Design a protein around this ligand. Sequence first.
Ligand SMILES: Cc1cc(C)c(NC(=O)[C@H]2C[C@@H]3CC[C@H]2C3)c(C)c1
Ligand SMILES: Cc1cc(C)c(NC(=O)[C@H]2C[C@@H]3CC[C@H]2C3)c(C)c1
Ligand SMILES: Cc1cc(C)c(NC(=O)[C@H]2C[C@@H]3CC[C@H]2C3)c(C)c1
Ligand SMILES: Cc1cc(C)c(NC(=O)[C@H]2C[C@@H]3CC[C@H]2C3)c(C)c1
Ligand SMILES: [K+]
Ligand SMILES: [K+]
Ligand SMILES: [K+]
Lengths: 141, 141, 141, 141, 339, 339, 339, 339
Amino acid sequence: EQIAEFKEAFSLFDKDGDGTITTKELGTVMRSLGQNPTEAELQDMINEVDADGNGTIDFPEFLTMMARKMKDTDSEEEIREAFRVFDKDGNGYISAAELRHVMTNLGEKLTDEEVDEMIREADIDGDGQVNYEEFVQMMTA
Amino acid sequence: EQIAEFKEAFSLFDKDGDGTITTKELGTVMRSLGQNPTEAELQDMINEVDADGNGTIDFPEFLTMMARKMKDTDSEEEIREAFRVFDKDGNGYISAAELRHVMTNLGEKLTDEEVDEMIREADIDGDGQVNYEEFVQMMTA
Amino acid sequence: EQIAEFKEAFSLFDKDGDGTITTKELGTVMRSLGQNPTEAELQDMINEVDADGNGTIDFPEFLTMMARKMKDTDSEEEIREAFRVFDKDGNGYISAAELRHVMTNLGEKLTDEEVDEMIREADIDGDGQVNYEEFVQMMTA
Amino acid sequence: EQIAEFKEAFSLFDKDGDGTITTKELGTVMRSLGQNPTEAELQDMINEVDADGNGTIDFPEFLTMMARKMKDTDSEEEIREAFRVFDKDGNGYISAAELRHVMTNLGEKLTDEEVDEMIREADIDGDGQVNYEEFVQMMTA
Amino acid sequence: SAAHKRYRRLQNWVYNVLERPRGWAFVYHVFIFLLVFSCLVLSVLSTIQEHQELANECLLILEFVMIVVFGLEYIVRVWSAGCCCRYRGWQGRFRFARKPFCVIDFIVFVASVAVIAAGTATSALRSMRFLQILRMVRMDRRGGTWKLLGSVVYAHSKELITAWYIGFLVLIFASFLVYLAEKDANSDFSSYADSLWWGTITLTTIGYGDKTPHTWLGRVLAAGFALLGISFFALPAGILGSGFALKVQEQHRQKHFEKRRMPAANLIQAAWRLYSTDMSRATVIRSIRILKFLVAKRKFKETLRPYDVKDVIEQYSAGHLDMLGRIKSLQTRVDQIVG
Amino acid sequence: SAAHKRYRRLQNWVYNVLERPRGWAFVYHVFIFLLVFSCLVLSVLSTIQEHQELANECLLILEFVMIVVFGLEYIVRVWSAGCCCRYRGWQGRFRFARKPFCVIDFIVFVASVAVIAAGTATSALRSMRFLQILRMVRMDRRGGTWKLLGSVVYAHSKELITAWYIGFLVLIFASFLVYLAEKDANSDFSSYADSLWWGTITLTTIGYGDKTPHTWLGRVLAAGFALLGISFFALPAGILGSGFALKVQEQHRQKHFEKRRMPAANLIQAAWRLYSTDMSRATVIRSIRILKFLVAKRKFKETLRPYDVKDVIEQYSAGHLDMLGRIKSLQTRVDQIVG
Amino acid sequence: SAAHKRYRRLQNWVYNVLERPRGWAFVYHVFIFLLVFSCLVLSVLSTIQEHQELANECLLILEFVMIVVFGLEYIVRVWSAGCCCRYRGWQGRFRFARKPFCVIDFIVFVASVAVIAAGTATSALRSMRFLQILRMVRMDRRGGTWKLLGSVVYAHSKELITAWYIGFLVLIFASFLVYLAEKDANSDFSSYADSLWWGTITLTTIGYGDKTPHTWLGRVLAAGFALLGISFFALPAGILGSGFALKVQEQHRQKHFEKRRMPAANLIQAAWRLYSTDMSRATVIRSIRILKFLVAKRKFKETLRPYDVKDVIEQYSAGHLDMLGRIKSLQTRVDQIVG
Amino acid sequence: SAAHKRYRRLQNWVYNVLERPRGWAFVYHVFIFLLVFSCLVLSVLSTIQEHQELANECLLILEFVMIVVFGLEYIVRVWSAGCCCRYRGWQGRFRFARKPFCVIDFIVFVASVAVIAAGTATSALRSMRFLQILRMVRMDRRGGTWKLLGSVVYAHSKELITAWYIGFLVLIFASFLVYLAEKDANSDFSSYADSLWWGTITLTTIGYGDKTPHTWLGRVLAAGFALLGISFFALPAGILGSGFALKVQEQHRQKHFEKRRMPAANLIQAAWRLYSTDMSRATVIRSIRILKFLVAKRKFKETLRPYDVKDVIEQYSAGHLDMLGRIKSLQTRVDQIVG
Ligand SMILES: Cc1cc(C)c(NC(=O)[C@H]2C[C@@H]3CC[C@H]2C3)c(C)c1
Ligand SMILES: Cc1cc(C)c(NC(=O)[C@H]2C[C@@H]3CC[C@H]2C3)c(C)c1
Ligand SMILES: Cc1cc(C)c(NC(=O)[C@H]2C[C@@H]3CC[C@H]2C3)c(C)c1
Ligand SMILES: Cc1cc(C)c(NC(=O)[C@H]2C[C@@H]3CC[C@H]2C3)c(C)c1
Ligand SMILES: [K+]
Ligand SMILES: [K+]
Ligand SMILES: [K+]
C-alpha cells in the first residue's frame, strides 16, 4: 500500500503515463505550487537519482528515494558533519543563539517562524546549549 | 592492387592532384553524401593521422589508416576496455538487454535496426548474456 | 574613553543606528571625502573584519581593528617580509635610492612628497642605506 | 666606440632624450620600417630586458642586450635543445630535407630563399645530413 | 526542577570530565599508562633475583592501587557518559557492551586480588592479566591505530604481496644453496632447517653470528643472496612509511581546503525543511524536499572533495555557455539587421 | 539442443568455478598454498632428526594428496577454461602452452611417485620438485608480481645504478684500507678476501661478529666507512619502497577519475559502425568511418588520461574563441553604425 | 661626527664580520667546530693508554686555545651585534640573555682553567664541559635543527604513535613467548628480563648474538615475531625520511612561486600611509586606512600561498560575471528592440 | 674527393661505432666492465692460498689482455671522436685533456707490464692500478652518477644536517652513559674509546657482539638510546631514497609534457634571422631581431617549464580582457542609444 501511494504521487508528475519524470514534468508540478526552480536546479535534482544518466527519473528510482528519505547512514553522518562545522569546542554542542544565527543568516535562510519551530523541537538545555547529535537522530529515524 | 584501390579513393578527396587532403576536401566529399560534420570535427579527424602537423593527410598516411582499420592491438585493447566499463561482475560478460540500453541511450545512439543487427551478430547465449571479448575479436580480425 | 571615541567614529558610518556597517555606509562616507572605491574594493575591506560573513562590520569588529592597528605580530612579520623581497643581500638593509624607486614606481605609487617624508623618517645611514627592520618596529609600536 | 654606436642606435628609439624606450618608441621605429608588431608583442619584447619592471628599456639594459647577442651559454644550450627536438636518433644530426621541412612549415616560416641560405651556410655532408651542434656554435661565436 | 537543575550542573561537571579523555587526553591517559607500565616493569623486575622481596611488597601495594583505581574509573566512565540521554537501561547494556571486556577483566582481577589476599603458574597468569589490561587501556578508542594501519596496509596490498613473495622465494633459494655449499664442512649447517634459520637471521640483517659460512663458496653465495634479498626484507617498512607520509600530507591539504560554511549551513536547512514536512503546524511536496535535500547533501560532500577535480569541467561548462550566448547574440543581431 | 542446454548450464557452473581463482581467490589459492607449504615444512622437519619417521609416513600420505589434487585440478582447469570457445583443439595446444610446464612437472612427479612406490640425491631431487611447484603455484598469473617489480625498478634505473655503483666503490675501498690496517695484528684479516668478506657483513649491517677490527686504526676506518656506506647499501630499499607508494597513490587517483561512460560508449558504436560497413544488409565511405573510429578511440584514451593535462589548453582555446567572437561582434557593430 | 663617521665605518666592518656567521657560515663555523671536535677527540685519546702523556700536554696547550678563542669571540659577538641600535644597555641584557648560558659556561670554564693551572672526577667534569660547549656551538641559532625536527615529527604524530604502540606490543608478546619456550633449556633466558633484553636486540636488528634461541620452538617463534615486528621498529625512520622529502619538495615549489613584487610593494605603502596618519605634516579617515592595510597584508599572504587554491574560485567568479554581463546585454537588447 | 668520400664513409663507420658507447652502451660497456672485474676477482683469489699459481699464470695472460685492449681502445676512442671537426690538433689536446688521466694510467701500466716482463709492495701497487682503472671505466662520463647524487644531497642538505647532528649527539651521550654504567664490571668498557666503538656498532645496528653490556643498568641505557638513535642513523637513507623517487616521478611528468614543437621550431628561426643580419646577401634593425630572439628563447624555456604555473595567470588575463571588451561594448551601446 505504501508503494501504491508513491505510485499515485509519481503519476502526478508523469501525467502522460510514460513511466519517466523529466525536467518538464518535475518543474511543471513545482511551479503549479508557486515554486520557481531554475532549469539548472531541475537538472541537479533529477541527476541525484538518475542512475541511467538519461535525464529522467523512473518509478524504481522514485520509490527508492521516497522509501529512504533521510534514514540512511550517509545522511546521518553528513548532517552531523555539517553541525560539527559550527562546533569549535568539539564537544557535540552548539548554542541556541549560534544555531539561530546560522539558520537565519547563511544559505537558504530560515524564516523566524521556521527557526522558532526548530529550536522548540530540540530539547534545549537550561544553559541554552543544543546537543545536535541527538537532533540528528530525530531527523534520521 | 589494394594500394591502387586506396589511391583511387584518395583521389576522390584530392581531386586537384595536390597529394593532400585538407578539411575542405574531406568535408566536401562528406557533405556530398549528406553528412554534416563541423569544422572542429573535420580538424579532429585529420589530426588523428596527420604526423606532419600541417593540417593535411597525404597518401602514405591515408594508406596506413586504410590498411590497418581496427586490426591493431591498440584497437583491440581499447575496445575491450570500453566494454569492461559496463561489466561490473568482471567476468567478461554483458547482458543483451544491457548492451541494448547502452547502444541506444548513450553517445551517438544506434538506431533500433543498427542495434538489432549488432545483437544478431554476437552469438548470444541462451540466458541472454554476451561474451564481448569474442565480439571484440570479430571486429579486430 | 578610547572606546567611546571609536563608537563616535563608528556612528558616522552607521548613521541609522542599526549597529552595522555595509558597503553602502562605508562607501558613502569614503566618497564624501572624495575617495572613489569600487564595489569590489568595499567588499574586500569589509570581508577583512567580518567574522559573521554576512557582509557587515559590527562595533566589536570595528573596535578590535581600531585598537589593534598594526601593533600585532602578524603585521610586524609580514611588513618585514615585504621589505625582504627587495633585500637581495639578506643583511636587513635597503638603499635609500632603491626604496625610493620601489615606493614611487610599483603598486599604489607614493607621490614625491610622500616618499620624501618616508625617507626623512627612517634614520638613514651616511652611506645611504636603510635598516628596514627598525623602520618596521617604528610602524609597529 | 662600440658603446657610442649602440648609444646612437638607442637614440633613434628615444628621440626625446628621456633615456628610456617604451612600446611607443620601439613600435614607432619598427612600423617606420614596415614591420607591424602588435601591442602584446611590443610588451613581450620590452619585458625580456626590463629589470625595473616599469615597461621601459634604459641604455644599460640596451647595451647589455647588444653586447651579448647570442654569445651567452644559455643561448647556445637552448638553441641546441631546439634542434634536438627534431633529432630522434640522438646522434646530433638532422637531414637537410628534414631541416628544410621544419624551417618552412612550422612557426614563423622561413621563405625559400631564407632557408636556401641557411642550408648553404651549414657545411652539409655528402649524404645530406647536418651536424647541427657545429651549426649552433657558428651562430654563437 | 531546581534540585534537578543542580543535577544537570552535575552532568555539566560530568561532561567536563568527559572532555579530558578526548580533548586534553595527554595528562590523564599518560598517568594511567604509567600506572599500567609501572605494574609491568615491577613484575619484570620481580622476576629477576637482584631486587625481589621489596619488589614483592611494592607489587602488593601497587596492585591494590590498580584495582581501586580501575574500580573508581569504571563508575566514573559509566556515569560520565550520557547520564540519561545514554540512560542507565538498554543504553546501559550498550555501555557495558563487548569492549568493556575490559570491565570483565577488571571484575575477574578483583577476584584474583581477593583470592591472593584471603583465598590463598600464578605469576604468569597475573602477568598476562596486566598485559590484557595493557592492550585495552592502550586501545579503548574502538578501532584506532589498528584502523589506520589496516587502511594503509590494505591500500598498498599489491606492492606488499610482491615484496613478501619475492623475499620468501629468495630466502628459500639462498638457504638451500648455502646448505648444499657446506653441509659437510660446517657442523652449523647440519640440516636444511639449520640453513633456513641462518637464512632468517641473514636476510633480516639481524646476524646473530651463531651460524656463519666457512667455505669460500658459501661465503660468495651468502654475499650475493644477501645483497639481493636484504632489500626485499626491508621494502615493507619503506612502502608503509612512505604511504603514511603521503596520506598525512594529502589529508592536511584536504582539511586545509576548509571551504564548508555555506554548503554545511544549507544542508541542515534542507534536512530541517524535509523533516518538518511531517510534523510542522504548517506526498509530491515531500518528494520535492527529498530531492532538494539530496542536492544539498552532495554540495556538502563536494566540499569534502577539495572542489578542484570537478571544477575544471565546471568552469568549462560556464565558459561554453558564455560563448554560446555570444554566438546567439551575434546571430540574432544579424537577424535583426540583415535578416 | 536441450541436452546441450544442460551442457551449457554445465559450462555455467564451469565458469562459475572459474570465478573463484580470479575473483574470490582468497580461500582456494590459500588452501592450495597451504598444501604446498605443508609439504615443504614437513620435508624440512624430515631433514632434522627429532621428528623423522612419523614425518616420513606423513610425507608419503601427503605426497599422495599432492599428486591426486594436482591430477584433479589439471583436468579442472583445462576444462574449466573456455570449453568450446577455447575449444579442445589448437586452443587445446594453447591451454597446454609453455607455462603449463607446471603440468609437465606434475606429470614427471607422477612418475616420481610411481618410481618411489613400485619402481623402487633422491630427497634433494624431490625437494627441488616441490620448490618448482612452489614457484609455479605462487606465479601462474603470467607476469604478475614480477611484472610490477620490473616496471618499477626499470623506472628508477638511473638512481639505482648510482646507489649500486657508489656502494660498491665504498665497499672495495673500505675492505682494502682495513685489510692494510691490520693484516699483521688480526689473524682474521689474513687475506684481502677475508677483508672483503668482513666488508660485506659490515656494509649491509649484518655484522656476524666473526671478524672485527682490533687495532685502533682499523676501528676508526671501519667506523668512518660504515657511516659513509651503510646508507648506500640501504638506498635501494628506500627508493623502491617510495616508488611503490607513489605509484599506488597515483593509480588510485587515476582510477578515481572514473569519467569514462560516454567516451567508452561512443567507441563501441564507432567500431560497430566501421565493422558493419563490410557486412551490413544496408571505399571513401569506409575511410570516413575509420577516421571517426580513430577520433573515438582517442577520446576514450583521453579518459585514461585524467583529462586535466590537456584541459588547461582546452579551456584556453574555448576562452580565446569566445573573446574572438566578442571582438568580431564589436567590430561588426562599428561597421553597422559608423561604417 | 667625522670621528664618529670612522666609528660608523667601524660598525661597517663590524656588520661585515656579522655576515660571515650567517651568510658564508661554512669556513668560520667549521673551523670552530674543528676546535671543539679536536678537543673532544684528544680527550678521548687521552683516556686510552697508548697515547697518554703527549696527549696531556697537547690537551693543556689546546684548552688554553679554547679559552682564549672563546674569550675573544665573546667580545667579538657582543660588540659585533647592533652596536648602538642594539645598544650596550638593556639590549645589553638581551645580548647576555639565557642562551648565552654558553657565555656562562665559558666564564666558569675560565675558572676551571685557572683552578687547574694555579688553584691546584675532574676529567669527567671537564669532558662534560666540552660536551655542553659541543651542544651550544652546534645549536646557538635558537631553535634550528630542533625546530625542524619537532615540526615534522608533530605533523606525523598520528602514524608515529601507531608505529610505537604496535611495535611495543609485539616486543612484549615475543619476549614472553620465547622466554616460555626455553626458560628451561637455555641458561640465557633465565628471567623474563633476559628475554626482554633479547627482544630489544632482536627487534631493532642489532643482534649481538649473546643470547639466541636454542630450541626448535624458540627459533620458530623468534623467526615469526622478528618478521612481524622488525618492520615496525623501522617505520619511524621511513615516515620521517619521507616527510622530510615531501616537505623539501613542497617548499621548493612554494618558493619557486616567487610572485611577490607588487603585493609586497603595496603592503609597505599601505603601512606607511596608515602610520603617517598620526605624524604627517599633512578617526574615520584612520579607520579606512586600517581596512586598506588589512586588505594589502592579505594580498601579500596570498602570495605566500601559491595563489592557486583560491584561483580556481577566483576565475569562476570572473567568468560568471562575464556570463552575467552577457545575459544582461542580451536581455536589454530584447527590451530595446521588442520591448 | 672520391677517396676522401671513402674517408668520409670511414668516419661514418667511425661515428656508428661512437653510437654503441652512448646508445646501446649495454653490451660493450658490460664486457669491458667484466674485463676489469675479472682482473680484480682474480687478483683477490690470487691473494688467498687455495688457488694461487694457476691464478698467477691466468693473471699474466689476462693483464696482457688488459693492456692490449686498452691500447687498442685508446686509438679507437681518439679517432672515433670527431675526426677532423674535432681535428687532431688543439682539439687533440682536448681529447687528451685531464680525464684521460685514464690514458695516463694506461701508459704507466704499459710500463708496469714491461717492467714485470723484461725489467724484472708490488702486488698492492698493481691492485691499486686496477682500482684506478675500475673507477675511471665506471665513470668516464664526466660527472654522472656523482653529479646526480650531489644535486640530490645538496637539495636535502637542511634535513641531512639535522639527521647527522642529532645522531652524533645521541651517539656521544649514549657511549658516555654506558661507559659510566659499567666501566668497572665489563672488561670490555675499559676506556671511553671502547664505549665509543660499542656505540658505533650499536647505533648503526651492526652489532658485532664483541662488546655488550652486562649490567642491568647498562642494558637499560643501551636499550633506550638504541631505540632513540638507531632511527637517526637510518634517516639519511630514507631521505635520499625518497628524494630520488620524487625526482624521478617529477622528471617523468615534466618530460611527459612534450609540448615543444612550435616553440623549438620558432627559436631556430629567430636565431638564424638574427645571425643572418651580419652575413646575408640581403644597428636598430639588429636590435629588434635580438629582442625577438630573446622572446623566442623564453617561449622555448616555458615549454621546459610544464606550461602550467604561468597558465593560471595567463588565462586570467585572457578572461579579464574578454570581460573588459564586454564592458566596453555595453558602455558604447549605451552611448549609441541613450548617449
Ligand atoms: C617475508 C616477509 C617479510 C616481511 C618484512 C614481513 N613483514 C611485513 O610485511 C610487515 C608490513 C606490515 C606490518 C607488519 C607486516 C605487515 C612479512 C610478514 C613477511
Ligand atoms: C651493491 C648492491 C647493493 C644492493 C642493495 C643491491 N640490491 C638491489 O639493488 C635490489 C633493488 C632491486 C630488488 C633486489 C635488488 C634489485 C645490489 C644488487 C647491489
Ligand atoms: C618502540 C619505539 C620504536 C622507535 C623506532 C622509536 N624511535 C622513534 O620513533 C624515533 C622517530 C623520532 C626521532 C627519534 C624517535 C622519534 C621509539 C621512540 C619507540
Ligand atoms: C652521523 C652520520 C650518519 C649518517 C647516516 C651519515 N651518512 C649520510 O648522511 C649519507 C647520505 C649521503 C650519501 C652518503 C652520506 C651522505 C653520515 C655521513 C653521518
Ligand atoms: K645486525
Ligand atoms: K649482528
Ligand atoms: K652479531
